Each structure stands twice: as structure tokens, then as C-alpha cells.
Scaffold this active site. Structure first.
Site, PDB file in Angstrom:
ATOM      1  N   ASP A  21      -2.763   3.603   6.386  1.00 53.59           N
ATOM      2  CA  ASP A  21      -2.009   4.035   7.548  1.00 53.59           C
ATOM      3  C   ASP A  21      -2.280   3.380   8.856  1.00 53.59           C
ATOM      4  N   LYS A  24       0.357  -1.087   8.479  1.00 52.40           N
ATOM      5  CA  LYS A  24       0.713  -2.419   7.984  1.00 52.40           C
ATOM      6  C   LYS A  24       2.184  -2.629   7.697  1.00 52.40           C
ATOM      7  N   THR A  25       2.747  -1.628   7.065  1.00 55.44           N
ATOM      8  CA  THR A  25       4.135  -1.655   6.673  1.00 55.44           C
ATOM      9  C   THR A  25       5.116  -1.617   7.858  1.00 55.44           C
ATOM     10  N   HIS A  85      -4.698   2.167   0.626  1.00 58.05           N
ATOM     11  CA  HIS A  85      -5.310   3.313   0.016  1.00 58.05           C
ATOM     12  C   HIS A  85      -6.231   2.634  -0.967  1.00 58.05           C
TER      13      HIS A  85
END
Length: 405
Positions: A21, A24-25, A85
RNA sequence: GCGGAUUUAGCUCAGUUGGGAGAGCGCCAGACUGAAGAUCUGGAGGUCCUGUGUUCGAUCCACAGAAUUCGCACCA
RNA sequence: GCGGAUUUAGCUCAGUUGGGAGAGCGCCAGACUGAAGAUCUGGAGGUCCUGUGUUCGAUCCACAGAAUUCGCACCA
């Protein structure tokens, strides 16, 4: 299938890594938007476009890695967005293994966290030679001191794994804000917006600090599978980043590693982001159609190469440490013929152990060294660490010492 | 991956008072009978799945690991 | 726990003159048989429920107890 791919500028692989979280996306989509604004034919991608599988949308996390494309005046980029993750490090490792440089995203509100370290280190065991950092979630914080701190730490950590943390570029920003802005309006250009402009800084850094590698196009072809698909009408496709040399339709290749023996095929397709390529060469992230191979005959971790050029892998020497009954491991030695499961990154494959001569049964707590021969080929590399687990438990920890095949 | 159940003799399996290592069937032997079958009698046969822990003491309790199995989660 | 009946051989039971411990069955053996069975021979077989007491002497009489068994624990 789709358009043709026409080489007009240099190609460079990059991607996103960092703690879960840290954003990155989001930042990936924001890069797509902003570059598109100044270079049309850059197809934009939102989150949903990236974190698309349902659980990804469900739990709200990246799980499979994703390839997006985008460019700048200066160059053309293939960008792999990885999950942070830890249950998914195997994947992250597979993507990071295609990067020529990586964008290490650190959330300013959180500072360096665990995968931040892990990713940097793993990034390295897989070849990433340059890292550029993007301190995200900045909007969330304003103590210049907490910023400056996070920066130190990140640099330090980089130092620990021997990146030139002192020189690594560190852009601070909010990707969420850039993205949001691009949503209001897709044509923002450099200078029009604050937040948007930081991405230009990132983009510049990537353009400037990560040098374009020197590919060995003359060496024998070698491309490590990163994924495998079954495409309708055409067939079995294997995707990956060419390590060296090149290919074009008509060439026959050898699928090496992770299996009894190797198999041969003729490449009947070559693409780069769903676009035809005549011949792909070292550095291209491509996809190859292979005549006759089923999905079962090719898989992540194996390797594509010039027939006979090589000895994905199946066998290797390895230095291992067997855990004590006490450390939750076995409580009885084992011997040749023992075949537990090996774990490298996100991979896990069963393998037969083969004790060297002069060694007959390995006991709990010993530091052995022996050979393993995997039931399937997979992407190995000397120095690659792994874990051995069997019967519900972890029985050893070791590192590849040499590739037998 | 999740979660359930199972692992005890060579096979199939009991085994909850935390202090005895078991039954059946097979292996052999004795008895028997012309001769064998059946029976009866005796015996031999065990990393209680593995490791660390709790305990005066663990097959049994806690924990981690493994295999098998069934159900679900995955499938261009 | 109220009363009666019962308690002798492995089983089922006789046993009244206070002095011999018995029967039937069974069990073991011998004879006979090709053997076993059936018959004949023979043998072993006992805490007379326990204790104490009465008596020259106790299965037997007295007291205490035990066990088995049957009936009894009912009236606003």
C-alpha cells in the site's frame, strides 16, 4: 494480435516495488496518464485497469504483477507493477527480475517498512542495477523533518544492500493527486500542475538516472519465461525479457530447465505489448508463440534458448542447512531419494535430493551441500536462496550454489 | 491457499487416569493327524509420522513441520 | 433396610438319634475300539456359609453376622 511494433526510440524495462500500500499501483496509472498527455499513443490505465482481478478489487491489493507500456520523448518503457504484500513476494520477484531499473516507492506517511527492505534486497538478487525512489503520500504529510528523515532511512537501507543510496534520486510526491488531476483533465502538460509535475520529475529521473543497458545481441538467445498463456486460435505463448541475442519467427528454440529433459520448438510469434515484432532482441519484453508446446510444456522459471546453448533450470548444487527438530524441523536424518519441496520466490516445486559421495544420511541440524533435481524447470540463478519444506513443515534453508541444468 | 479428519507391528486397525506398547490376520515353532486343513498353545515382530517444548514421568498436552485424504479457492 | 425360605462335592441335591460326611450327574483313568462314543471297573473330589458359644462329641442346638431368594415400605 493488433498493430505492429515499430522501433523509434530506446527500450527500457522498469517497474514498481515497495511495502504494501505504499501506492505502487496508483503511481503506475499516474505515469500512464501523464506520459500519454505528451505522447499520444500511450494508452492510459487506471487502477481497475491494473488491479483487475476480482480479489485484487476485492481485498484491495495487487496480487498478480502487471505489464503496462508507456513512453517519454527520450524512451520507450515496459513497466511491471508488483505486489508488496509478502504473501506475494514470489511474484514481485518474478517481475523485478525483468527490470533494468526499479522505482522503489516509499510512503512518506509510513516511512520505510519491511518489504521496503526485502524488495530492495530481492531486487538486487535478481539483477536490478538501479533504483530510483519515489516518496509517495506526501500530501499526507508536511513536516519537512519527517520528510527528510524518511529520505535518510531509505538511502541508508539502500546503502545496506549496496545501492548508491547516496546518489539515488529521490522524488517526493502524491500519485493519488496526480491521478486525480489527470482524471479532471487528461491533457495537463508539464508545468500545468504541481502534483502532475512531480511525476514528470519521476519520469525524468527514470529517463536520466537509469541508463539504457547494453544488451548483448550477439550472444546466444536466452529468455527466461515469466509467464505462459494460451491464446485463442494461435496457441501457447511464453512471455519474458530477452536476456541476450534475439529471435524471430521461424527460429527454433530450446525450452530449458525444470523438467526431465529439455524440448524444442519453433517460434511462430513475436510481440511486444500485443504488437507484432519482426524480431525481438535482448531487452525486449516479449511473448513468443511456440509450435506444439502445451501450457504444461512451458512454464514460468524455465528458459528459452539457442538449442544446445544451455545446460529455466532443473538441477543444481546447493548449500543447505537442515533445521533442528527444535527449530520446528525434522527429527530423523534423510538420504538420497528424499524428495521434498523447494521454494524460490513465489515458486514451489518438488525435488529429489542426492547426497554427495561420502555423505549418506543428513541429519537434523547439519549444514549439508548436495544436489537437487526439480520435477519441473524453473528460473534459477546461483546465490538464489530457497526454503525446503516437506510434510507440513519447513525442513531446511539453503542457496543455489551452481547450476547443474 | 484455506479448513476438516487420519498417521500406532509386515497388512487393517484399537488405544484418554500423563506411569503396561496392543488385538486380529500373516511369519515360524509345538501340539494334532496316516497326511495334511481347522483348531488350540507359544514365540518373533514397533524411529506410537518428525522436531522442539511443558512434565517426576509423554503414544497421550502445547507448538512448528511432513504425508495422505475430503471439502472449498485457483484455471485463456 | 421388616419378616419368612434357603446356604453340604465342580453341578443339582439327600442327610432326624448329636458320634459314618452322602447320592445322582459330572470329571480322570483302566478294560473294550481301528479310534472316539456307548457299557462295565476304579479313582479322586468337602471352609457341611463365617465366628463365637453349648456339649465327652456339632452339618444338626444357641447367638451374632454374611449371602441368595420371595413377600412387605400402607391412611389428606
Amino acid at each position: 494480435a493488433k498493430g505492429e511494433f515499430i522501433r523509434t526510440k530506446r527500450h527500457v524495462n522498469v517497474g514498481t516495488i515497495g511495502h504494501v500500500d505504499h501506492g505502487k499501483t496508483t503511481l503506475t496509472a499516474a505515469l500512464t496518464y501523464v506520459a500519454a498527455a505528451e505522447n499520444r499513443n500511450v494508452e492510459v490505465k487506471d487502477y481497475g485497469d491494473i488491479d483487475k482481478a476480482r480479489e485484487e478489487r476485492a481485498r484491495g491489493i495487487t496480487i498478480n504483477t502487471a505489464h503496462v507500456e508507456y513512453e517519454t520523448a527520450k524512451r520507450h518503457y515496459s513497466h511491471v507493477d508488483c505486489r508488496g504484500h509478502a504473501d506475494y513476494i514470489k511474484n514481485m520477484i518474478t517481475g523485478a527480475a525483468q527490470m533494468d531499473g526499479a522505482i522503489l516507492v516509499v510512503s512518506a506517511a509510513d516511512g520505510r517498512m519491511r518489504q521496503t527492505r526485502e524488495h530492495i534486497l530481492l531486487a538486487r538478487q535478481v539483477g536490478v542495477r538501479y533504483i530510483v525512489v519515489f516518496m509517495n503520500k506526501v500530501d499526507m504529510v508536511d513536516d519537512r523533518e519527517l520528510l527528510d528523515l524518511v529520505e535518510m532511512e531509505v538511502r541508508d537501507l539502500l546503502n545496506q544492500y549496496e545501492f548508491r543510496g547516496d546518489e539515488v534520486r529521490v522524488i517526493r510526491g502524491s500519485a493519488l493527486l496526480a491521478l486525480e488531476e489527470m482524471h479532471k483533465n487528461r491533457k495537463t502538460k508539464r508545468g500545468e500542475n504541481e502534483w502532475v509535475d512531480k511525476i514528470w520529475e519521476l519520469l525524468d529521473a527514470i529517463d536520466e538516472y537509469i541508463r539504457t543497458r547494453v544488451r548483448d545481441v550477439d550472444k546466444r538467445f536466452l529468455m527466461r519465461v515469466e509467464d505462459v498463456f494460451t491464446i485463442t486460435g494461435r496457441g501457447t505463448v511464453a512471455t519474458g525479457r530477452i536476456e541476450r541475442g534475439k529471435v524471430k519467427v521461424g527460429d527454433e528454440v530450446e525450452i530449458v530447465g525444470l523438467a526431465r529433459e529439455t524440448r524444442k520448438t519453433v517460434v511462430t510469434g513475436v510481440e511486444m505489448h500485443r504488437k507484432t515484432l519482426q524480431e525481438g532482441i535482448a531487452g525486449d519484453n516479449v511473448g513468443l508463440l511456440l509450435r506444439g508446446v502445451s501450457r504444461e510444456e512451458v512454464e514460468r522459471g524455465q528458459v528459452l534458448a539457442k538449442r544446445g546453448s544451455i545446460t529455466r533450470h532443473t538441477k543444481f548444487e546447493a548449500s543447505v542447512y537442515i533445521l533442528k527438530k527444535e527449530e520446528g524441523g525434522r527429527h530423523t536424518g534423510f538420504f538420497t531419494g528424499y524428495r521434498r519441496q523447494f521454494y524460490f520466490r513465489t515458486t514451489d516445486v518438488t525435488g529429489v535430493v542426492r547426497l554427495r559421495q561420502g555423505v549418506e544420511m543428513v541429519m537434523r541440524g547439519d549444514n549439508v551441500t548436495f544436489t537437487v533435481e526439480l520435477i519441473k524447470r524453473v528460473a534459477l540463478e546461483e546465490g538464489l536462496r530457497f526454503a525446503i519444506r516437506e510434510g507440513g513443515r519447513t525442513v531446511g534453508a539453503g542457496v543455489v550454489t551452481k547450476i547443474l541444468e
